[PDB]
Write an enzyme that holds these catalytic residues in place. Structure first.
Site, PDB file in Angstrom:
ATOM      1  N   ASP A 121       5.395  -5.914   9.989  1.00  0.00           N
ATOM      2  CA  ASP A 121       4.602  -4.680   9.979  1.00  0.00           C
ATOM      3  C   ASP A 121       4.125  -4.250  11.368  1.00  0.00           C
ATOM      4  O   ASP A 121       3.056  -4.659  11.823  1.00  0.00           O
ATOM      5  CB  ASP A 121       3.405  -4.798   9.020  1.00  0.00           C
ATOM      6  CG  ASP A 121       2.753  -3.453   8.717  1.00  0.00           C
ATOM      7  OD1 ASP A 121       3.006  -2.466   9.448  1.00  0.00           O
ATOM      8  OD2 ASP A 121       1.975  -3.385   7.743  1.00  0.00           O
TER       9      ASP A 121
ATOM     10  N   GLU B 223      14.732  -8.001   7.549  1.00  0.00           N
ATOM     11  CA  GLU B 223      15.071  -9.406   7.407  1.00  0.00           C
ATOM     12  C   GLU B 223      14.319  -9.968   6.211  1.00  0.00           C
ATOM     13  O   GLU B 223      13.134  -9.689   6.027  1.00  0.00           O
ATOM     14  CB  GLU B 223      14.705 -10.183   8.671  1.00  0.00           C
ATOM     15  CG  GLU B 223      14.829 -11.694   8.553  1.00  0.00           C
ATOM     16  CD  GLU B 223      14.376 -12.412   9.810  1.00  0.00           C
ATOM     17  OE1 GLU B 223      14.097 -11.732  10.820  1.00  0.00           O
ATOM     18  OE2 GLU B 223      14.298 -13.659   9.789  1.00  0.00           O
TER      19      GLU B 223
ATOM     20  N   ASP C 187      -2.641  -4.996  13.374  1.00  0.00           N
ATOM     21  CA  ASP C 187      -2.682  -5.089  11.917  1.00  0.00           C
ATOM     22  C   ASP C 187      -2.559  -6.523  11.404  1.00  0.00           C
ATOM     23  O   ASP C 187      -2.498  -6.751  10.196  1.00  0.00           O
ATOM     24  CB  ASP C 187      -1.589  -4.216  11.297  1.00  0.00           C
ATOM     25  CG  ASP C 187      -1.856  -3.896   9.839  1.00  0.00           C
ATOM     26  OD1 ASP C 187      -2.974  -4.183   9.361  1.00  0.00           O
ATOM     27  OD2 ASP C 187      -0.949  -3.355   9.173  1.00  0.00           O
TER      28      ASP C 187
ATOM     29  N   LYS D 222      12.240  -2.157   1.852  1.00  0.00           N
ATOM     30  CA  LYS D 222      10.942  -1.569   1.538  1.00  0.00           C
ATOM     31  C   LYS D 222      11.111  -0.072   1.265  1.00  0.00           C
ATOM     32  O   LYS D 222      11.625   0.661   2.109  1.00  0.00           O
ATOM     33  CB  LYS D 222       9.944  -1.796   2.677  1.00  0.00           C
ATOM     34  CG  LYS D 222       8.607  -1.107   2.441  1.00  0.00           C
ATOM     35  CD  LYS D 222       7.437  -1.816   3.104  1.00  0.00           C
ATOM     36  CE  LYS D 222       6.119  -1.218   2.633  1.00  0.00           C
ATOM     37  NZ  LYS D 222       4.928  -1.903   3.201  1.00  0.00           N
TER      38      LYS D 222
ATOM     39  N   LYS E 122       0.833  -1.201   0.000  1.00  0.00           N
ATOM     40  CA  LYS E 122       0.000   0.000   0.000  1.00  0.00           C
ATOM     41  C   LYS E 122       0.872   1.258   0.000  1.00  0.00           C
ATOM     42  O   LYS E 122       0.699   2.139  -0.838  1.00  0.00           O
ATOM     43  CB  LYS E 122      -0.932  -0.009   1.218  1.00  0.00           C
ATOM     44  CG  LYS E 122      -2.139   0.912   1.111  1.00  0.00           C
ATOM     45  CD  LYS E 122      -2.986   0.867   2.379  1.00  0.00           C
ATOM     46  CE  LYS E 122      -3.884  -0.363   2.452  1.00  0.00           C
ATOM     47  NZ  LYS E 122      -5.115  -0.234   1.617  1.00  0.00           N
TER      48      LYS E 122
ATOM     49  N   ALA F  16      12.581 -12.940   4.224  1.00  0.00           N
ATOM     50  CA  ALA F  16      11.851 -14.163   4.539  1.00  0.00           C
ATOM     51  C   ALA F  16      11.712 -15.013   3.271  1.00  0.00           C
ATOM     52  O   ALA F  16      10.794 -14.796   2.481  1.00  0.00           O
ATOM     53  CB  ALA F  16      10.487 -13.823   5.111  1.00  0.00           C
TER      54      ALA F  16
HETATM   55  C1  LIG Z   1       6.870 -18.395  -4.941  1.00  0.00           C
HETATM   56  N1  LIG Z   1       7.456 -17.880  -3.688  1.00  0.00           N
HETATM   57  C2  LIG Z   1       7.008 -18.660  -2.513  1.00  0.00           C
HETATM   58  C3  LIG Z   1       8.929 -17.904  -3.781  1.00  0.00           C
HETATM   59  C4  LIG Z   1       9.504 -16.834  -2.850  1.00  0.00           C
HETATM   60  O1  LIG Z   1       8.729 -15.624  -3.014  1.00  0.00           O
HETATM   61  C5  LIG Z   1       8.885 -14.652  -2.068  1.00  0.00           C
HETATM   62  C6  LIG Z   1       7.973 -13.595  -2.029  1.00  0.00           C
HETATM   63  C7  LIG Z   1       8.095 -12.573  -1.084  1.00  0.00           C
HETATM   64  C8  LIG Z   1       9.152 -12.601  -0.169  1.00  0.00           C
HETATM   65  C9  LIG Z   1       9.320 -11.623   0.814  1.00  0.00           C
HETATM   66  C10 LIG Z   1       8.560 -10.573   1.170  1.00  0.00           C
HETATM   67  C11 LIG Z   1       9.153  -9.952   2.201  1.00  0.00           C
HETATM   68  C12 LIG Z   1       8.861  -8.828   2.982  1.00  0.00           C
HETATM   69  N2  LIG Z   1       7.767  -8.088   2.798  1.00  0.00           N
HETATM   70  C13 LIG Z   1       7.534  -6.856   3.582  1.00  0.00           C
HETATM   71  C14 LIG Z   1       6.704  -7.110   4.849  1.00  0.00           C
HETATM   72  C15 LIG Z   1       6.443  -5.776   5.563  1.00  0.00           C
HETATM   73  C16 LIG Z   1       7.469  -5.154   6.270  1.00  0.00           C
HETATM   74  C17 LIG Z   1       7.246  -3.937   6.909  1.00  0.00           C
HETATM   75  C18 LIG Z   1       6.004  -3.311   6.828  1.00  0.00           C
HETATM   76  N3  LIG Z   1       5.824  -2.150   7.483  1.00  0.00           N
HETATM   77  C19 LIG Z   1       5.190  -1.068   7.005  1.00  0.00           C
HETATM   78  O2  LIG Z   1       4.723  -1.021   5.867  1.00  0.00           O
HETATM   79  N4  LIG Z   1       5.111  -0.041   7.868  1.00  0.00           N
HETATM   80  C20 LIG Z   1       4.516   1.145   7.647  1.00  0.00           C
HETATM   81  C21 LIG Z   1       3.745   1.426   6.519  1.00  0.00           C
HETATM   82  C22 LIG Z   1       3.148   2.678   6.369  1.00  0.00           C
HETATM   83  C23 LIG Z   1       3.307   3.656   7.346  1.00  0.00           C
HETATM   84  C24 LIG Z   1       4.065   3.384   8.479  1.00  0.00           C
HETATM   85  C25 LIG Z   1       4.659   2.133   8.622  1.00  0.00           C
HETATM   86  C26 LIG Z   1       4.971  -3.941   6.125  1.00  0.00           C
HETATM   87  C27 LIG Z   1       5.195  -5.162   5.491  1.00  0.00           C
HETATM   88  N5  LIG Z   1       9.710  -8.486   3.966  1.00  0.00           N
HETATM   89  C28 LIG Z   1      10.807  -9.185   4.214  1.00  0.00           C
HETATM   90  N6  LIG Z   1      11.121 -10.254   3.499  1.00  0.00           N
HETATM   91  C29 LIG Z   1      10.320 -10.651   2.502  1.00  0.00           C
HETATM   92  O3  LIG Z   1      10.404 -11.687   1.639  1.00  0.00           O
HETATM   93  C30 LIG Z   1      10.061 -13.664  -0.213  1.00  0.00           C
HETATM   94  C31 LIG Z   1       9.935 -14.683  -1.154  1.00  0.00           C
END
Ligand SMILES: CN(C)CCOc1ccc(-c2cc3c(NCCc4ccc(NC(=O)Nc5ccccc5)cc4)ncnc3o2)cc1
Length: 266
Positions: free
Chosen positions: A149, A86, A131, A37, A18, A88
């Protein structure tokens, strides 16, 4: 140690979020694989969410748990802010649900156990998530569930504003109605997840915000036939309108359906 964009080699787009995109990245000197990010300052401030990002970093500097995704640090440049996360490797539980459709009782119970532990650790430091949802559940290299998050997390028993834009599916009645809430919001979210993992869709799903609202408010859900008695018991204990009627996290971990089906210890 101050971080800059030129310290990293940016790689595969990991997800569309988002507030920004997540990319794979490697720190040049160490070759350390991680996730970055990218959030845009302009957008963050236009939405009035700039200070929440600061509070996430704050909260994540005090959290160390194997089922919680690490935030290593942060930096910014002319136009945007970067979270160094980190990585994942096995991706989101969200994607896993789409792939598998629904989860068996063993996988579900194990995810709820790992969630419960993570959240039990959070509540003992007075941090509540607010969340919890499959997009924010990530999988480590051994398939272990990791909570991500904390941008909507709060320090104390508070009544602050969460994201009422975007689906209400995982938010409890006291939050969508703008009522005072506490650590019990996370146990409602557990119930919604437990239902979704087994069924394949969350319990208050509707094609309208307005209807999903009414359903959460009434606590209006029904189980398909393939959902077992024990699971129905746990879910029903979690999805209570009154927060104080919801169990403590240690009751969930001691729930016979969880202990009979979870492959991981409490
Ligand atoms: C097919 N498949 C299984 C093979 C592998 O595919 C993937 C797909 C995605 C990932 C993936 C996603 C991911 C990831 N996504 C971000 C998660 C996240 C982190 C921080 C936040 N925080 C945030 O947005 N804070 C915020 C937002 C707005 C205002 C204030 C704070 C939200 C979501 N983070 C770390 N490692 C990751 O690895 C890894 C492998």
């Amino acid at each position: 140690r101050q971080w800059a964009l030129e310290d990293f080699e940016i790689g595969r787009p990991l997800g569309k979020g988002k507030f920004g995109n997540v990319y794979l990245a490697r720190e040049k000197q160490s070759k350390f694989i991680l996730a970055l990010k990218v959030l845009f300052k302009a957008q963050l401030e236009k939405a009035g969410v700039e200070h929440q990002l600061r509070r996430e970093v704050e909260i994540q500097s005090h959290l160390r748990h194997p089922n919680i995704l690490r935030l290593y640090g942060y930096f910014h440049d002319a136009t945007r802010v970067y979270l160094i996360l980190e990585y994942a490797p096995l991706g989101t539980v969200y994607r896993e649900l789409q792939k598998l459709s629904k989860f068996d009782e063993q996988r579900t119970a194990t995810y709820i156990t790992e969630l419960a532990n993570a959240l039990s650790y959070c509540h003992s430091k007075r941090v509540i998530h607010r969340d919890i949802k499959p997009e924010n559940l990530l999988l480590g290299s051994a398939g272990e569930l990791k909570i991500a998050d904390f941008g909507w997390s709060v320090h104390a028993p508070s009544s602050r504003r969460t994201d009422l834009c975007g689906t209400l599916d995982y938010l409890p009645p006291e939050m969508i109605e703008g009522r005072m809430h506490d650590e019990k919001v996370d146990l409602w979210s557990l119930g919604v997840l437990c239902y979704e993992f087994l069924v394949g869709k969350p319990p208050f799903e509707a094609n309208t915000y307005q209807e999903t609202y009414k359903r959460i408010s009434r606590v209006e859900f029904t189980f398909p036939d393939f959902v077992t008695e024990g699971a129905r018991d746990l879910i029903s204990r979690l999805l209570k309108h009154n927060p104080s009627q919801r169990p403590m996290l240690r009751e969930v971990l001691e729930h016979p359906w969880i202990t009979a089906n979870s492959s991981k210890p409490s």
